[PDB]
A paper describes a structure:
As a scaffold for aromatic cluster design, we chose ferritin as a protein cage platform with a 12 nm outer diameter and an 8 nm inner cavity, composed of 24 subunits. To prove this concept through protein engineering, we focused on a two‐fold symmetric inter‐subunit interface of a recombinant horse spleen apo‐L ferritin (Fr) as a target region for mutagenesis. Herein, we present the construction of an aromatic cluster with an artificial molecular binding pocket at the two‐fold symmetric interface of ferritin and explore its ligand‐binding characteristics. We developed a system that uses ligand binding as a driving force to induce and propagate changes in the orientation of multiple aromatic side chains.
To modulate the shape of the central pocket, we prepared Fr‐F5/59A (Fr‐[name]/[name]/[name]/[name]/[name]/[name]) and Fr‐F5/59L (Fr‐[name]/[name]/[name]/R59L/[name]/[name]) in which residue 59 was replaced with Ala or Leu (lower). In the case of Fr‐F5/59A, the replacement of Phe59 with alanine (Ala) results in an expanded pocket size. Conversely, in Fr‐F5/59L, the introduction of leucine (Leu) imposes steric hindrance, effectively obstructing the pocket's entrance. These variances in pocket morphology among the variants are anticipated to impact ligand binding affinity and specificity. Replacing Phe59 with Ala or Leu significantly reduced the incorporation amount of NR (1.4 molecules for Fr‐F5/59A and 0.4 molecules for Fr‐F5/59L). Although there was sufficient space for NR in the A59 pocket (distance between A59–A59' 7.9 Å), the substitution of F59 with A59 excluded π–π stacking interactions at the site. As a result, NR has poor affinity to bind at this site in Fr‐F5/59A.
Numbering used by the authors:
A (entry chain A), B (entry chain A), C (entry chain A), D (entry chain A), E (entry chain A), F (entry chain A): 1 to 174
Write the structure that this text describes.
């Protein structure tokens, strides 16, 4: 079969392809979230920019996984990409909750693939995830949790005021 | 008649003169809105600056239309410029609603003139509007809609606080 | 009434609004003169540029008056802007004569408002006109008189030659 | 409904959403083509880079369409993204033929949407496609046709030699 | 037939080839006008330079049309280029009148090809002409009309003096 | 007749006009060759660029001849420009052979005009050709001969491979 493949199981190869799909689905979800916040009747630029950046970031993750698949002699296989779970995303709070849920699911998938790699004595795979994904993911979830907490603190009798202030004073815009 | 005029109908020539009037009326309306927000008892600099800029922008549009009238061999004809519809403009929300109404009317006038040009097989006219007015107008209306949405989100028990915060954190001032 | 208004009569406030109208009418007249000289069958760029600049200059004068109205606690009130006195402006000589007539009328209006301010013991108003309008106006009328004299000297059996040479050698173009 | 929507038909809105799907599907197809050419048993870097760039370019096209949908007051709706038509793409020639087929299909979709816009008297839509998509698409198809011709000229008894030389001397690598 | 041709009619292809011929004929006419004004017994450098530049400009137009023909998959076909209508071009006025006549004929040909493109639902063709030819042509005809008017104003008892002054003070030389 | 003409025969004047025609015909032939090699089904950029440059170079030669005609007091006379000998130009080899044939014909025409000048004791004419045309022409024919030899060496069982390699490694492209 492959002239380069070594210590690279069919199980890991398949799970890498599945993880690419999950990252591209996440990218697609973030594209939808970003354009929702760009609507004239939502109009929260800082939220749009936050999710738009994550769409690019998740696509980059898929690209890195696909590059690694080839470096190890595996074969990239693509599947249909499921549309995002929602067409409208509600409030900034609703969206940030959905994002944390998505990220925890991606994180569990990274942890599951790491555990498979460990079980299969594939240290290149384990290091790859540890070096390029696990800490990036922990840092992103921490940031979303921080944001969630600030959004929640700003919700009261005055939800619109809080939603505006969060977008203007925490999120990057211009 | 003209040594240069070619494929330039009397109907388009007249409609161009009418459109100049509409743009200058819009400029005048924006001058009034700007100075209203500069009043010591209104005092919203960011709103003043927003409308003052649009007054200049609409005058520029009229200048471009008049330059084109001459480039095509038509004759600029000016009519009286009607005073703005109001002497006092209410809240930022009231003003931004009035501006969107004005812009939609200008947009319909651009679309009507484009349709006349198309019907008269005048592609220079059509391209002129498409290249210098149609997208500029769509972009401006999108921005006003975004602003309207943010102003509306900030209205509640605390309308003054919201009006101040919008002017300070969304609109350009200094 | 106003939290800032002091020593600012209703008569001066009204006369300031009237003077804004006169300056905007003058701006409009200069816009018409400029585009007339831009016609393919007139084609005197230096004359077009001269009047176009005056259109901007007169609008600036109206802006300064409106800013002052607000600084004093008065209320800007806009009226319809009458179309210019002519649709076609004749020769450079005819146009420059019309401009001097317009400027003398604006000057008389400045002098009349100054006299009202003096009579009402409003030195801020008097100084405002003296510092930003009276000398600017005298300088502009002197320049137009100089131009008129040169245009007249160039009129003879060869009026077209003189009109061309004045536009090329006295007026700014490029 | 929308505070900004004007002259924007439901038919165009739906067709824009469909066109976004087509552009994202094209991006996905190009991602697959690129990683196929990055395989250790294919190893044609210049071809990988060509298709990888087109994946980014087609995603950019979808982003521009989605931005426009919002600028016009329409609502972005996403659908499932179908996996590419092939898992393996054959030779450079096979791939370049598949790309031209894909591009002609995207081009027909642009032309169809332009015709709908024209029929609906939507000049903003027509100009948008003309200014940002029609010529870009014609230029890309011309380049692929040029490439196809050069690949074909290099096919003979020595197909591998030709495939290597095309990748090294025509396509960008490093 | 062509691997790239799409939505490109035989009628448009033929009309593009005809238009190339017209632009090259115009270039040739301008070459002749330029060298006539370079004669020692004509000696009007500014007029020579004006027409020489237009010869280059019209050739550039033909080059752009030929590039587009290829981008669309059509086939460039060249025909004999007819010599200019005159061997001697008379006065600057005679020449500028001939140039405006030539330009109006080229403009009508552009408008005719645009109308054919519109009728054939070929928006790439329509946009190409609108973006690279229609406004350039309107601007050039406006300039020639301006020149004609100035030349005419300078004709009187003293035609030679006027012809010299126009060449020295309006046209670019050095 | 001419105030400047001296030692400039009617025979040389006529032959100069004929030579201008030949150079412009050559320019036209090179324009056709260049656009043929730009076809999507030919696609040899380096060959297109080679012939496109020669089209410009031959037009420059005609311009220099026309400038000289005027410097000597002769009168430029233009004739119809015959279309190129072919609509399709075959292979790079076929085209380069046609170009050498064209250049040898231009060279013979230069030599014939030089011999006429010598016979008529017109040393300005002789020097003009020697200084600006004879060596340029010898250098160009040497380059085409070098190219012909390299194209011929690359023709064998693998003509397409050779044609590609010549265009990529000898001719300038980018
Ligand atoms: Cl499937
Ligand atoms: Cl009236
Ligand atoms: Cl009224
Ligand atoms: Cl679904
Ligand atoms: Cl023939
Ligand atoms: Cl003939």
């Amino acid at each position: 079969s492959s002239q380069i493949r070594q210590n690279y199981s069919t199980e890991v190869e398949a799970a890498v392809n599945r993880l690419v799909n999950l990252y591209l689905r996440a990218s697609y979800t973030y594209l939808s979230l970003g354009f929702y916040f760009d609507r004239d009747d939502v109009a929260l630029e800082g939220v749009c920019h936050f999710f738009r950046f994550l769409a690019f970031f998740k696509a980059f993750g898929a690209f890195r996984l696909l590059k690694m698949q080839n470096q190890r002699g595996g074969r990239a296989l693509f599947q249909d990409l499921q549309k995002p779970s929602q067409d409208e995303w509600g409030t900034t709070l609703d969206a940030m909750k959905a994002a944390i849920v998505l990220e925890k699911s991606l994180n569990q998938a990274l942890l599951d693939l790491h555990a498979l790699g460990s079980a299969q004595a594939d240290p290149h795979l384990c290091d790859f995830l540890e070096s390029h994904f696990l800490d990036e993911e922990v840092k992103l979830i921490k940031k979303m949790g921080d944001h969630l907490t600030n959004i929640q603190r700003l919700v009261g009798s005055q939800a619109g005021l809080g939603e505006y202030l969060f977008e203007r004073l925490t999120l990057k815009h211009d």
